[PDB]
Amino acid sequence: TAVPHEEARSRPHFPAYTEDVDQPMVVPDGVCCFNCDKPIDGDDINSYVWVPSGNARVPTTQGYFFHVKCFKCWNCKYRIIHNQFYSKDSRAWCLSCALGRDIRVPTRRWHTSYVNTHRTGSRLTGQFFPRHRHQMEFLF
Amino acid sequence: PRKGHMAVFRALEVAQQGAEGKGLDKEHLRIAYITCMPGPTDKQVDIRSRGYYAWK
Amino acid sequence: NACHVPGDQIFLVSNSFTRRLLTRTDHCPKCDRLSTFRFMSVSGMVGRMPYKPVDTPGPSYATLYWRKQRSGKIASQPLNEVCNK
Amino acid sequence: QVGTLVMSQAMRHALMDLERAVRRKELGLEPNYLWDRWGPIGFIDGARADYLPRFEHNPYVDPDGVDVTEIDVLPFNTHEQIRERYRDFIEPDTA
Amino acid sequence: RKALQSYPVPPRARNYERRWSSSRTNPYNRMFWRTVLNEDFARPSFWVSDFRHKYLAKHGMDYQGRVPASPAPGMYQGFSDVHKILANHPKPQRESRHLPVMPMTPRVVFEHAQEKRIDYAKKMHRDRRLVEQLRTHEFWGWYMKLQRVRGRWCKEHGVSSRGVYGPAVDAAELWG
Amino acid sequence: YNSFERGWKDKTVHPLDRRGRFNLDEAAAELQLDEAYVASLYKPLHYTYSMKGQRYPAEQGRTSRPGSLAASRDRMFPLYRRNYKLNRELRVLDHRRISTD
Amino acid sequence: RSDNVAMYFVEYKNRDMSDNHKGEDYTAGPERFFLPPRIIETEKGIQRPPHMQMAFDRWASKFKTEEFHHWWRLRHAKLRYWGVRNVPHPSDVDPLWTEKEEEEWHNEMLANT
Amino acid sequence: FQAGVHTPHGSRYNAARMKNWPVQEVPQNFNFTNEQRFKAKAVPRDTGKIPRDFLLSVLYRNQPCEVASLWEHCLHDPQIVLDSKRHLREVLQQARAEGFVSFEKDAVTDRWVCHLTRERFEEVRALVGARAEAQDLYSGLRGASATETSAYSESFREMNEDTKREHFRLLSEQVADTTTHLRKFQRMEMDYLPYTDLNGKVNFMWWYEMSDTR
RNA sequence: UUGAAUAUAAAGAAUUAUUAUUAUAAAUAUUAUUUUAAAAAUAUAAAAAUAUUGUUAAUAAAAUUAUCAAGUUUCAAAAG
Ligand SMILES: [Zn+2]
Ligand SMILES: [Zn+2]
Ligand SMILES: [Zn+2]
């Protein structure tokens, strides 16, 4: 956000309900899975993990898109532990494998990440209401 | 709305229902003695706070 | 104060419809059908709080910037009216 | 039973990878059969071995739109109708 | 307290201790940065980090290449609960060439019992809306029949539904 | 409460949710979702699948009393009988899916 | 009976000038709570605004099912778990609305026939 | 909306009259107090389909059009469903947010031009199609003597050879005079009724028919 | 079920109580237990001008807040 500093929220670290009236923040029509590439249901569902990496544009009109089951590391094929992934040439790679490390099986759930669906886990960060200098508000 | 008055009124419709059989009048009938008689008393366990019990 | 699959609207919610607040079902005009709306942000209160002015909670710094775009710069159309009839 | 082989789940997932290799060269594409990168150390490509009773949340996905499922391999029950269908893959080449 | 060796998978949340520390959640995102950042943290997982000590001896060099994962068939055959003398990988195989098959340890089967009860949960929600997308979807479709049949009836019976006054109080477009 | 005497009655049963009369199996046919399954979505998951649940004791039905026959928990609550086909088909892992040898 | 709170009967004034409650009777409540209220026989020849009496049975439609007849059967178990005196067992709570009470009303909608 | 209350006298907009609203005269002494001028909570205007389906068919005719002289066009259609300059502007806010129209200041000039947005442009082309498909049914000439206007088929086709832009100029004022006669002998009177949706937002359902007075 | 066998609703604080038993899995069911015409204390505090520690053994680590809930500084004593 703009929110110069010392004005962002403090205890939960982020404001609830990012208002986005400036740009509507809707899921696009030419949308597709980053990892799998199959078209994604438009918006009627939460089967897709829509990671809008703040303002992304490059992965899609909005940010990366993944069906909940295509959200695995492509190279090692298990889950993306702690959900930090590494977009290796348009196929999300697990950070540890994508980083060169080799420990290649987790404990809890192997082939399905712990992620939230439809940005609901990604709305802890990124683009709160005053994105940019919107001083239209106080000016005449 | 008391309970005592609804219990006796349960009788004064049954008692006179039986009184009229004995020949007793339905109208001129009075209440001579209406007395309470101490009766059966169950014992229920009650569990007061802090490990003390006192039988309701 | 509520959006859409692709659009927006605005509405002040009461106490009675607090259930439908988060995600409502409504006629999306950038379509012709009822479509599920969300709650992009707050725009005030449905009544007064005790001992407080008319705008006790205040709409927002955010929902104002949504208003200042709808009414805002209408300078494209003070033509055909300004406020008259 | 006469010849209907008791096909364990491992098989009906090994007969899927074979059928998916057939459909590919039936689509005209290159049939990259999975178990022809499989050598004495496992996948020669240095990849993590794909273990066969594959989880339903890790289905082998080929971004070419090839469909193979349980409805596909259940008729290939007995020994004979695979030695002719997947003849080209189960048989090694001696030339 | 229900020793962790009893749970099919070790528990997700791991409660500790610390009279002077009150927080349920284990601090992940710190156990993650270490491990991803530092190679050494997690024991080498013998095989993928053996196969050196066997290349160096037989080739006179450092391997200098990415080691294959998925330990070769025939390695760790006397071990029984590998799971540590490996990564959490399965016991590799017999010394065979048969297609890889997961040795259905009690653990692997449990994971199957999750990825079916994950598909189960996401299916009981996916269609609790699909029918909630009929009830409210068709309630509106019907409610507009109501406002239509009310719309038709309120014209012949002339109930303008706008107060005790005539429309001459409306036409002013004041309050009155 | 239009009672004038509150009780286990004249407690207006749903003073909301006026959109009654849902034909589930009829609607379930439009969605093509196994009519026996859809109706299970709309009752506590205790009642249909093999899940840990809490039952009221009258719901359990009493032994054959001098006043009343043995009223089993089913013949008084038919739509609460668990459907263990629908459980197994959905919730438990079949020998088949992991048969490796 | 549940406490000495008084009970007033607040009713709107003149209903003979109404359109929805023209000649209804309120000397007694509806038999099953989804059944429309008894009418004064002297004005039995009254019909209603449709939007009022077509949305009512839309609401009253959910109690004419058996899923509510299960929630009715069930509730009588709750009130016994919470023990409330004088609650019949859910084994003798035969439904409110029934098929014998179906035949009259579908043939009481002869207007739309 | 009355003559002298909110507006100066004689500004009896010759557009679709509201139904049952008696237009009464107010003395030319009228003026609000310095505060009643502002309280004056108006009546909300329909912005639904029938105006938004009717406005766009205008802006589809006059694709680039200066906003100022826009209202002087909707008056011309026989199917004007618009009560006054206020109703147009509120519909024009609606159709603006829908994404249908898009105002751009006509750079060479200082006036905006309601440009039909290219996003939903191929929708209105179909939309103007159905109404015209359903409008030519009504006319008593379309079907009685179709050959009277078969004189028009060839002309306008060969008209678009030499003077197409100058042909309709006279045709524009011609209809503007012939739609007024109609608008004296029939108007689309708008009878509206409020109604509350399940979310408690009181709004008005509308409909329009043509009142025959002669 | 197509496995032989085997068995699937309910705890603990004395209770139908403070009480999500967090092994898991996600994410809009319009799932359904809370009497009532008053002022004292008291639990408690919405609201509200001045004053800022004069109260007290001693103010300042002391619930939540869309008015978005955070005192700054110096010295002395004091390890992990
Ligand atoms: Zn995907
Ligand atoms: Zn990986
Ligand atoms: Zn929309």
Side-chain angles (χ1 to χ4, degrees), chain A residues 28-65:
Chain A
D29 262 348
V31 55
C32 44
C33 178
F34 208 60
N35 261 329
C36 63
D37 263 69
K38 306 313 162 189
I40 274 186
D41 174 77
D43 68 37
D44 316 274
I45 202 153
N46 70 331
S47 89
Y48 56 86
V49 174
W50 161 31
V51 170
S53 282
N55 313 164
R57 305 304 102 82
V58 177
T60 307
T61 320
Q62 232 327 315
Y64 317 52
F65 273 94

Short mmCIF file of all heavy atoms in Angstrom, two decimals, chain A residues 28-65:
data_model
loop_
_atom_site.label_atom_id
_atom_site.label_comp_id
_atom_site.label_asym_id
_atom_site.label_seq_id
_atom_site.Cartn_x
_atom_site.Cartn_y
_atom_site.Cartn_z
N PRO A 28 -9.65 -13.63 -14.26
CA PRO A 28 -9.84 -13.36 -15.68
C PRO A 28 -10.54 -14.51 -16.38
O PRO A 28 -10.83 -15.55 -15.80
CB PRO A 28 -8.41 -13.19 -16.20
CG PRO A 28 -7.61 -14.03 -15.31
CD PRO A 28 -8.26 -14.02 -13.96
N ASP A 29 -10.82 -14.29 -17.67
CA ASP A 29 -11.39 -15.34 -18.50
C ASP A 29 -10.32 -16.17 -19.20
O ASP A 29 -10.41 -17.40 -19.24
CB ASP A 29 -12.33 -14.72 -19.54
CG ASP A 29 -13.78 -14.78 -19.11
OD1 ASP A 29 -14.08 -15.50 -18.14
OD2 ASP A 29 -14.62 -14.12 -19.75
N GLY A 30 -9.30 -15.52 -19.76
CA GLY A 30 -8.15 -16.24 -20.29
C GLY A 30 -7.23 -16.71 -19.19
O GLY A 30 -6.05 -16.36 -19.16
N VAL A 31 -7.77 -17.48 -18.26
CA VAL A 31 -7.05 -17.95 -17.09
C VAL A 31 -6.69 -19.41 -17.28
O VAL A 31 -7.45 -20.17 -17.90
CB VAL A 31 -7.90 -17.75 -15.82
CG1 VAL A 31 -9.25 -18.42 -16.00
CG2 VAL A 31 -7.20 -18.28 -14.61
N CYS A 32 -5.53 -19.81 -16.74
CA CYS A 32 -5.09 -21.21 -16.85
C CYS A 32 -4.11 -21.57 -15.74
O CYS A 32 -3.45 -20.67 -15.23
CB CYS A 32 -4.42 -21.45 -18.20
SG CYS A 32 -3.28 -20.13 -18.66
N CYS A 33 -4.02 -22.85 -15.40
CA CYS A 33 -3.12 -23.36 -14.33
C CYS A 33 -1.67 -23.08 -14.72
O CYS A 33 -1.32 -23.32 -15.86
CB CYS A 33 -3.37 -24.85 -14.37
SG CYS A 33 -2.46 -25.94 -13.26
N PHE A 34 -0.85 -22.54 -13.81
CA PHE A 34 0.58 -22.34 -14.13
C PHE A 34 1.24 -23.70 -14.24
O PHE A 34 1.93 -23.95 -15.22
CB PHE A 34 1.29 -21.75 -12.92
CG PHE A 34 2.51 -20.91 -13.19
CD1 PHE A 34 2.43 -19.76 -13.95
CD2 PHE A 34 3.73 -21.24 -12.62
CE1 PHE A 34 3.54 -18.98 -14.17
CE2 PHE A 34 4.84 -20.46 -12.84
CZ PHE A 34 4.75 -19.33 -13.62
N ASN A 35 1.03 -24.55 -13.24
CA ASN A 35 1.70 -25.87 -13.22
C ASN A 35 1.11 -26.80 -14.26
O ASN A 35 1.88 -27.48 -14.95
CB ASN A 35 1.59 -26.51 -11.84
CG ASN A 35 2.84 -26.34 -11.00
OD1 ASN A 35 3.94 -26.28 -11.53
ND2 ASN A 35 2.66 -26.29 -9.69
N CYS A 36 -0.21 -26.83 -14.39
CA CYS A 36 -0.85 -27.84 -15.27
C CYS A 36 -1.27 -27.30 -16.65
O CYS A 36 -1.21 -28.09 -17.61
CB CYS A 36 -1.85 -28.66 -14.46
SG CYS A 36 -3.26 -27.77 -13.75
N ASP A 37 -1.71 -26.04 -16.75
CA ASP A 37 -2.07 -25.36 -18.03
C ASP A 37 -3.49 -25.64 -18.50
O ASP A 37 -3.93 -24.98 -19.44
CB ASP A 37 -0.95 -25.33 -19.06
CG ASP A 37 -0.18 -24.02 -19.04
OD1 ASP A 37 0.53 -23.78 -18.05
OD2 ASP A 37 -0.32 -23.24 -20.01
N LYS A 38 -4.20 -26.55 -17.83
CA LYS A 38 -5.62 -26.78 -18.16
C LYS A 38 -6.41 -25.52 -17.80
O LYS A 38 -6.15 -24.98 -16.73
CB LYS A 38 -6.13 -27.96 -17.33
CG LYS A 38 -5.29 -29.23 -17.46
CD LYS A 38 -4.96 -29.55 -18.90
CE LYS A 38 -3.79 -30.51 -19.04
NZ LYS A 38 -3.36 -30.63 -20.46
N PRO A 39 -7.38 -25.04 -18.60
CA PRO A 39 -8.21 -23.90 -18.22
C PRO A 39 -8.84 -24.11 -16.85
O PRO A 39 -9.11 -25.24 -16.44
CB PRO A 39 -9.27 -23.83 -19.33
CG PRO A 39 -9.11 -25.09 -20.13
CD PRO A 39 -7.71 -25.54 -19.95
N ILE A 40 -9.06 -23.01 -16.16
CA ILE A 40 -9.58 -23.01 -14.80
C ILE A 40 -11.00 -22.47 -14.83
O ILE A 40 -11.29 -21.50 -15.54
CB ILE A 40 -8.68 -22.17 -13.86
CG1 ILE A 40 -7.54 -23.02 -13.32
CG2 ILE A 40 -9.46 -21.58 -12.72
CD1 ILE A 40 -6.73 -22.29 -12.31
N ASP A 41 -11.90 -23.11 -14.07
CA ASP A 41 -13.26 -22.61 -13.90
C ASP A 41 -13.24 -21.13 -13.59
O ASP A 41 -12.40 -20.65 -12.82
CB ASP A 41 -13.96 -23.36 -12.77
CG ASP A 41 -15.32 -22.77 -12.46
OD1 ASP A 41 -16.27 -23.03 -13.23
OD2 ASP A 41 -15.44 -22.02 -11.47
N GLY A 42 -14.18 -20.39 -14.18
CA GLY A 42 -14.11 -18.95 -14.14
C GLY A 42 -14.08 -18.37 -12.74
O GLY A 42 -13.02 -17.93 -12.28
N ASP A 43 -15.20 -18.38 -12.04
CA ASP A 43 -15.17 -17.99 -10.64
C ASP A 43 -16.16 -18.76 -9.77
O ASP A 43 -16.26 -18.45 -8.58
CB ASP A 43 -15.41 -16.48 -10.50
CG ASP A 43 -16.83 -16.04 -10.88
OD1 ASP A 43 -17.82 -16.74 -10.60
OD2 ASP A 43 -16.94 -14.93 -11.44
N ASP A 44 -16.90 -19.71 -10.32
CA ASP A 44 -17.99 -20.30 -9.56
C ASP A 44 -17.52 -21.20 -8.44
O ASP A 44 -18.36 -21.81 -7.76
CB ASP A 44 -18.89 -21.09 -10.51
CG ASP A 44 -19.17 -20.34 -11.79
OD1 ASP A 44 -20.13 -19.53 -11.81
OD2 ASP A 44 -18.43 -20.53 -12.77
N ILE A 45 -16.21 -21.28 -8.20
CA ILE A 45 -15.65 -22.36 -7.41
C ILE A 45 -14.41 -21.86 -6.67
O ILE A 45 -13.85 -20.81 -6.99
CB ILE A 45 -15.30 -23.56 -8.31
CG1 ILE A 45 -15.22 -24.86 -7.52
CG2 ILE A 45 -13.99 -23.32 -9.01
CD1 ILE A 45 -15.53 -26.08 -8.36
N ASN A 46 -14.02 -22.61 -5.65
CA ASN A 46 -12.75 -22.44 -4.97
C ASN A 46 -11.88 -23.68 -5.15
O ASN A 46 -11.20 -24.11 -4.22
CB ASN A 46 -12.96 -22.13 -3.50
CG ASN A 46 -13.49 -23.30 -2.72
OD1 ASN A 46 -14.19 -24.15 -3.27
ND2 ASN A 46 -13.18 -23.35 -1.44
N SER A 47 -11.91 -24.27 -6.34
CA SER A 47 -11.00 -25.35 -6.67
C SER A 47 -9.64 -24.86 -7.10
O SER A 47 -8.71 -25.66 -7.22
CB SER A 47 -11.58 -26.20 -7.79
OG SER A 47 -11.19 -25.69 -9.04
N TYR A 48 -9.50 -23.57 -7.37
CA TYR A 48 -8.24 -23.01 -7.82
C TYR A 48 -7.59 -22.17 -6.73
O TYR A 48 -8.26 -21.47 -5.99
CB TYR A 48 -8.44 -22.15 -9.06
CG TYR A 48 -9.43 -21.04 -8.88
CD1 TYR A 48 -9.05 -19.82 -8.36
CD2 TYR A 48 -10.74 -21.21 -9.25
CE1 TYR A 48 -9.95 -18.82 -8.20
CE2 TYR A 48 -11.65 -20.21 -9.10
CZ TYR A 48 -11.25 -19.01 -8.57
OH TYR A 48 -12.17 -18.01 -8.42
N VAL A 49 -6.27 -22.26 -6.65
CA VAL A 49 -5.50 -21.48 -5.70
C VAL A 49 -4.99 -20.25 -6.44
O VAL A 49 -4.02 -20.33 -7.19
CB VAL A 49 -4.33 -22.28 -5.12
CG1 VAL A 49 -3.48 -21.39 -4.27
CG2 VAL A 49 -4.85 -23.43 -4.31
N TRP A 50 -5.69 -19.13 -6.30
CA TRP A 50 -5.33 -17.94 -7.11
C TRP A 50 -4.34 -17.10 -6.32
O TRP A 50 -4.78 -16.43 -5.38
CB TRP A 50 -6.55 -17.12 -7.51
CG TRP A 50 -6.25 -15.72 -7.91
CD1 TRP A 50 -5.12 -15.25 -8.51
CD2 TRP A 50 -7.13 -14.59 -7.78
NE1 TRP A 50 -5.23 -13.91 -8.75
CE2 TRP A 50 -6.45 -13.47 -8.31
CE3 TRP A 50 -8.42 -14.41 -7.26
CZ2 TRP A 50 -7.02 -12.20 -8.33
CZ3 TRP A 50 -8.98 -13.15 -7.29
CH2 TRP A 50 -8.28 -12.07 -7.81
N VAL A 51 -3.07 -17.18 -6.67
CA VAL A 51 -2.03 -16.41 -5.94
C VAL A 51 -1.88 -15.11 -6.69
O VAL A 51 -1.22 -15.12 -7.74
CB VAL A 51 -0.70 -17.17 -5.93
CG1 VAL A 51 0.44 -16.31 -5.39
CG2 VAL A 51 -0.78 -18.49 -5.18
N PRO A 52 -2.44 -13.98 -6.23
CA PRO A 52 -2.21 -12.75 -6.91
C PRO A 52 -0.99 -12.23 -6.17
O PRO A 52 -1.13 -11.84 -5.05
CB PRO A 52 -3.40 -11.94 -6.44
CG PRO A 52 -3.62 -12.39 -5.02
CD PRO A 52 -3.26 -13.86 -5.03
N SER A 53 0.17 -12.24 -6.83
CA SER A 53 1.41 -11.84 -6.12
C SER A 53 1.43 -10.32 -6.14
O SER A 53 2.21 -9.75 -6.90
CB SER A 53 2.61 -12.39 -6.81
OG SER A 53 2.77 -13.77 -6.50
N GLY A 54 0.61 -9.72 -5.29
CA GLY A 54 0.46 -8.25 -5.35
C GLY A 54 0.00 -7.91 -6.74
O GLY A 54 -0.88 -8.62 -7.25
N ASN A 55 0.60 -6.91 -7.36
CA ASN A 55 0.22 -6.69 -8.76
C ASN A 55 1.14 -7.60 -9.56
O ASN A 55 2.36 -7.39 -9.46
CB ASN A 55 0.28 -5.21 -9.11
CG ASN A 55 -0.38 -4.33 -8.07
OD1 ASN A 55 -0.17 -3.12 -8.05
ND2 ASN A 55 -1.17 -4.93 -7.20
N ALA A 56 0.60 -8.59 -10.27
CA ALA A 56 1.49 -9.54 -10.96
C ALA A 56 1.53 -9.24 -12.46
O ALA A 56 2.62 -8.93 -12.95
CB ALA A 56 0.99 -10.93 -10.73
N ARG A 57 0.40 -9.34 -13.15
CA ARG A 57 0.33 -9.05 -14.60
C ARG A 57 1.04 -10.14 -15.41
O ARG A 57 0.41 -10.72 -16.29
CB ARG A 57 0.92 -7.68 -14.94
CG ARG A 57 0.29 -6.53 -14.17
CD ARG A 57 -1.21 -6.47 -14.36
NE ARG A 57 -1.92 -7.02 -13.22
CZ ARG A 57 -2.17 -6.34 -12.10
NH1 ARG A 57 -1.75 -5.09 -11.99
NH2 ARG A 57 -2.82 -6.91 -11.11
N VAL A 58 2.32 -10.40 -15.12
CA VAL A 58 3.11 -11.34 -15.97
C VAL A 58 2.57 -12.77 -15.95
O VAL A 58 2.36 -13.30 -17.05
CB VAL A 58 4.58 -11.33 -15.52
CG1 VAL A 58 5.41 -12.33 -16.32
CG2 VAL A 58 5.19 -9.94 -15.62
N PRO A 59 2.29 -13.40 -14.80
CA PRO A 59 1.87 -14.80 -14.82
C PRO A 59 0.56 -14.89 -15.59
O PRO A 59 0.37 -15.85 -16.31
CB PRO A 59 1.67 -15.12 -13.34
CG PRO A 59 2.54 -14.12 -12.63
CD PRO A 59 2.43 -12.86 -13.46
N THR A 60 -0.32 -13.92 -15.41
CA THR A 60 -1.64 -13.88 -16.10
C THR A 60 -2.04 -12.40 -16.06
O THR A 60 -1.18 -11.59 -15.67
CB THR A 60 -2.64 -14.83 -15.44
OG1 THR A 60 -2.07 -16.14 -15.35
CG2 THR A 60 -3.95 -14.92 -16.18
N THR A 61 -3.26 -12.04 -16.46
CA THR A 61 -3.64 -10.61 -16.31
C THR A 61 -3.49 -10.34 -14.82
O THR A 61 -3.00 -9.27 -14.46
CB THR A 61 -5.08 -10.40 -16.76
OG1 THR A 61 -5.30 -11.18 -17.93
CG2 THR A 61 -5.39 -8.95 -17.04
N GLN A 62 -3.90 -11.30 -13.99
CA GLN A 62 -3.66 -11.19 -12.54
C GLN A 62 -2.53 -12.18 -12.22
O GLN A 62 -1.86 -12.61 -13.15
CB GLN A 62 -4.93 -11.45 -11.74
CG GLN A 62 -5.22 -10.34 -10.74
CD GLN A 62 -3.95 -9.74 -10.20
OE1 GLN A 62 -3.01 -10.44 -9.83
NE2 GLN A 62 -3.91 -8.42 -10.13
N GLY A 63 -2.39 -12.60 -10.97
CA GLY A 63 -1.25 -13.44 -10.59
C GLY A 63 -1.41 -14.91 -10.92
O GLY A 63 -2.46 -15.26 -11.45
N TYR A 64 -0.38 -15.72 -10.66
CA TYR A 64 -0.39 -17.18 -10.92
C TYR A 64 -1.72 -17.83 -10.53
O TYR A 64 -2.35 -17.40 -9.56
CB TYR A 64 0.69 -17.82 -10.06
CG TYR A 64 2.01 -17.09 -10.01
CD1 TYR A 64 2.07 -15.75 -9.67
CD2 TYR A 64 3.20 -17.75 -10.26
CE1 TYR A 64 3.28 -15.08 -9.61
CE2 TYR A 64 4.41 -17.10 -10.19
CZ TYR A 64 4.46 -15.76 -9.87
OH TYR A 64 5.66 -15.11 -9.81
N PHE A 65 -2.06 -18.92 -11.21
CA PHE A 65 -3.29 -19.67 -11.02
C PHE A 65 -2.97 -21.15 -10.98
O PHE A 65 -2.26 -21.65 -11.85
CB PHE A 65 -4.29 -19.39 -12.13
CG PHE A 65 -5.14 -18.20 -11.88
CD1 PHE A 65 -4.79 -16.97 -12.37
CD2 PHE A 65 -6.31 -18.33 -11.17
CE1 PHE A 65 -5.58 -15.88 -12.14
CE2 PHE A 65 -7.10 -17.24 -10.95
CZ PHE A 65 -6.73 -16.02 -11.43
#
